Amino acid sequence: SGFRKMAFPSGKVEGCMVQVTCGTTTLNGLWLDDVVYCPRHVICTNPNYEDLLIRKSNHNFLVQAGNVQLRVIGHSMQNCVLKLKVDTANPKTPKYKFVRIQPGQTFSVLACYNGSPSGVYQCAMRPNFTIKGSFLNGSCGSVGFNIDYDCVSFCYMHHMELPTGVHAGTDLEGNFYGPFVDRQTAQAAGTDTTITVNVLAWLYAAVINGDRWFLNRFTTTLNDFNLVAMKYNYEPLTQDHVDILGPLSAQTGIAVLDMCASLKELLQNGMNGRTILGSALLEDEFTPFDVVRQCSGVTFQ
Amino acid sequence: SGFRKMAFPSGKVEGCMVQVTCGTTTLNGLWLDDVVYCPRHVICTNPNYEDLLIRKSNHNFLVQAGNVQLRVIGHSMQNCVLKLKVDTANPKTPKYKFVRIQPGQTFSVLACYNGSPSGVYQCAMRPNFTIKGSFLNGSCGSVGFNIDYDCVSFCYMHHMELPTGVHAGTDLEGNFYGPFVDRQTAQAAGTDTTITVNVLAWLYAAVINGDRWFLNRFTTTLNDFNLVAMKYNYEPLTQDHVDILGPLSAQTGIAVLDMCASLKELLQNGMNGRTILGSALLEDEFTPFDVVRQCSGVTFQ
Numbered sequence: 001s002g003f004r005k006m007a008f009p010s011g012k013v014e015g016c017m018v019q020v021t022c023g024t025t026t027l028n029g030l031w032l033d034d035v036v037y038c039p040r041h042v043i044c045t046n047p048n049y050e051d052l053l054i055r056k057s058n059h060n061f062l063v064q065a066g067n068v069q070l071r072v073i074g075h076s077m078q079n080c081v082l083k084l085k086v087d088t089a090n091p092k093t094p095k096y097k098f099v100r101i102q103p104g105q106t107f108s109v110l111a112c113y114n115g116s117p118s119g120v121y122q123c124a125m126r127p128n129f130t131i132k133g134s135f136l137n138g139s140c141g142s143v144g145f146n147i148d149y150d151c152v153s154f155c156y157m158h159h160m161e162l163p164t165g166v167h168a169g170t171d172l173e174g175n176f177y178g179p180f181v182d183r184q185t186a187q188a189a190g191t192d193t194t195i196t197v198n199v200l201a202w203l204y205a206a207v208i209n210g211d212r213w214f215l216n217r218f219t220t221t222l223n224d225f226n227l228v229a230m231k232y233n234y235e236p237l238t239q240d241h242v243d244i245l246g247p248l249s250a251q252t253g254i255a256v257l258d259m260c261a262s263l264k265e266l267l268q269n270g271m272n273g274r275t276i277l278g279s280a281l282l283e284d285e286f287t288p289f290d291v292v293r294q295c296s297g298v299t300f301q
Numbered sequence: 302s303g304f305r306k307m308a309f310p311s312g313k314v315e316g317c318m319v320q321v322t323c324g325t326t327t328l329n330g331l332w333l334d335d336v337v338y339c340p341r342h343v344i345c346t347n348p349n350y351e352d353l354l355i356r357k358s359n360h361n362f363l364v365q366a367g368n369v370q371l372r373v374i375g376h377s378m379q380n381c382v383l384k385l386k387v388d389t390a391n392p393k394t395p396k397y398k399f400v401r402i403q404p405g406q407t408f409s410v411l412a413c414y415n416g417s418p419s420g421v422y423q424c425a426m427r428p429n430f431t432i433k434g435s436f437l438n439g440s441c442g443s444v445g446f447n448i449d450y451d452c453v454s455f456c457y458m459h460h461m462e463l464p465t466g467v468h469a470g471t472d473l474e475g476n477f478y479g480p481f482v483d484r485q486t487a488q489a490a491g492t493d494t495t496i497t498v499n500v501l502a503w504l505y506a507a508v509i510n511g512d513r514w515f516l517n518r519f520t521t522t523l524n525d526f527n528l529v530a531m532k533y534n535y536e537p538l539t540q541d542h543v544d545i546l547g548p549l550s551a552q553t554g555i556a557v558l559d560m561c562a563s564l565k566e567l568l569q570n571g572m573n574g575r576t577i578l579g580s581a582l583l584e585d586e587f588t589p590f591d592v593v594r595q596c597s598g599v600t601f602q
């Protein structure tokens with residue numbers, strides 16, 4: 001038992017991290033087969049990246065993979081990411097995919113500096129398309145990912161920090177999550193909301209782990225739940241959410257709509273100085289998947 | 302910015318995990334050079350492990366490393382761990398050390414099942430020498446570790462779960478942390494306490510990240526702080542603790558004893574529906590080291 005914020009084993013991604021240096025900008029890149037993916041603002045000198053990139057040669061890009069100099073033989077820009085074609089394919093390339101995730105979905109982040117991984121933690125893509133990460137200078141280019149058996153599904157590359165200390169970035173094809181753009185002009189996060197289906201998943205995790213104090217005899221309609229949810233800045237719960245929580249409902253014997261009644265009362269009354277899973281807040285960065293994976297034992301390799 | 306519960310990159314340990322099977326017991330083992338380390342209760346059939354181990358041959362131990370059968374050519378028992386000598390040294394062996402940590406020190410856990418890593422999270426060794434982990438059937442043999450530049454310092458191997466859902470285990474030389482023994486007889490955790498120096502470190506992390514609301518104009522003596530600390534089930538703070546928090550004190554300009562005054566008032570008055578670092582509880586599983594590493598940028602390779 002127990003319940004922890006669990007990242008995927010990072011080793012398959014660690015063997016892909018590289019340093020990309022050109023001019024006075026150094027950042028992290030991601031080396032899969034013979035391409036190195038990195039944020040496009042590595043390009044030298046309110047920017048126009050087309051104009052800036054036609055002015056560069058291959059030999060301007062210094063790519064260090066360990067103690068080895070990688071030779072750039074081609075380059076192209078796709079959205080906000082640069083793709084540097086190197087003369088060597090990465091022997092540690094895992095089976096992988098590029099995936100653009102939906103808000104509410106979680107992933108693991110391997111924080112890197114100078115192509116050297118520093119730590120791994122678990123994140124969610126917030127409803128306003130930021131992540132509450134942990135990132136310092138030089139972290140851009142670090143990626144977020146999920147692993148499914150033997151396949152790394154990369155879903156995030158880090159670019160910037162917003163004034164409120166949250167983080168914005170792109171999928172691996174360079175498309176920002178949310179309305180953000182890669183230039184140092186005024187922009188800010190939209191107002192965020194709580195990921196309701198995830199909170200319910202976490203409540204089910206509590207029940208699986210022996211915590212029951214927050215349950216009740218009440219029930220509620222989907223409509224009536226959403227009316228109280230909206231009041232507490234929670235995302236609406238759809239029938240689709242209900243269906244994903246099906247198998248957790250069936251493991252525990254608590255109908256989804258019964259767990260909604262318990263959540264409703266938690267919102268209306270607070271937790272009164274009690275904790276759920278060692279937390280005094282309702283936690284919303286576990287998906288229904290995350291819960292099932294951690295309380296059944298699904299490994300990856 | 303931001304502040305996350307950050308585990309070390311796990312890749313260096315993932316390449317050491319193996320399956321150890323003998324009789325009807327299968328668990329995880331740790332393959333460094335030509336030895337496989339695993340919990341001794343893999344031994345067949347209130348136990349007497351000497352007697353049980355003299356009755357086994359090498360060919361009773363099935364060790365799977367990937368799709369490869371490892372051949373056991375020797376075995377020895379050291380405390381509660383078994384050391385299986387295999388005919389092949391692990392080519393992915395990192396630079397490493399075996400270290401027995403003090404309570405309050407944190408580490409990363411790579412949860413494994415059948416020699417296949419499942420996830421990584423960060424833990425602390427509680428003052429009562431348990432860890433609040435996340436572990437299912439077949440997780441014993443999973444290790445906890447720290448990384449310092451290029452060196453893995455293994456400090457924990459997992460053995461058992463206690464009735465309260467916390468976890469007990471050994472160092473890599475087989476010595477249990479705490480008073481626990483590896484047999485299925487009544488035993489339970491001592492009463493735990495909060496790791497005071499870690500809570501203070503986390504408060505400094507809050508200040509580094511821009512949170513200041515909990516500070517105050519008051520100050521306090523070391524003695525007077527410990528008198529209120531003891532009342533709230535906190536560990537005593539020693540002058541040695543004070544000195545470790547030195548460099549965090551100097552980064553922030555808040556004398557250690559001034560941060561103690563702020564902690565004192567937090568304990569006496571609660572947090573009044575505010576949060577520190579997205580937490581509504583005082584968090585005690587970050588060491589002063591962890592904070593400095595995460596808010597300065599120390600990498601490892």
Ligand SMILES: *CCC(=O)N(C[C@@H]1CCNC1=O)NC(=O)[C@H](CC1CCCCC1)NC(=O)[C@@H](NC(=O)OCc1ccccc1)[C@@H](C)OC(C)(C)C
Pocket residue numbers: 027039041135136137138139140141159160161162163167181182183184185186187302
């Ligand atoms: C690529 C370098 C890098 O690692 N990184 C990550 C952030 C540094 C600190 N924490 C991080 O996660 N990105 C950057 O530093 C950005 C570099 C820009 C170069 C030009 C194209 C866009 C990326 N800069 C930022 O992330 C800044 N944020 C920002 O400019 O937001 C828009 C904005 C501009 C002006 C006013 C208000 C908002 C950060 C570093 O600046 C602050 C505000 C966080 C201090």
Ligand SMILES: *CCC(=O)N(C[C@@H]1CCNC1=O)NC(=O)[C@H](CC1CCCCC1)NC(=O)[C@@H](NC(=O)OCc1ccccc1)[C@@H](C)OC(C)(C)C
Pocket residue numbers: 001328340342436437438439440441442460461462463464468482483484485486487488
């Ligand atoms: C090695 C198998 C394994 O993965 N594992 C880890 C735990 C399983 C579930 N969560 C875990 O972390 N260890 C075991 O399952 C233990 C096997 C024992 C074999 C003989 C030598 C000692 C290890 N068993 C336990 O951890 C049990 N705990 C236990 O027996 O505690 C002492 C005790 C005995 C009797 C009464 C009260 C306390 C667990 C699995 O049993 C419960 C109580 C947690 C259900």
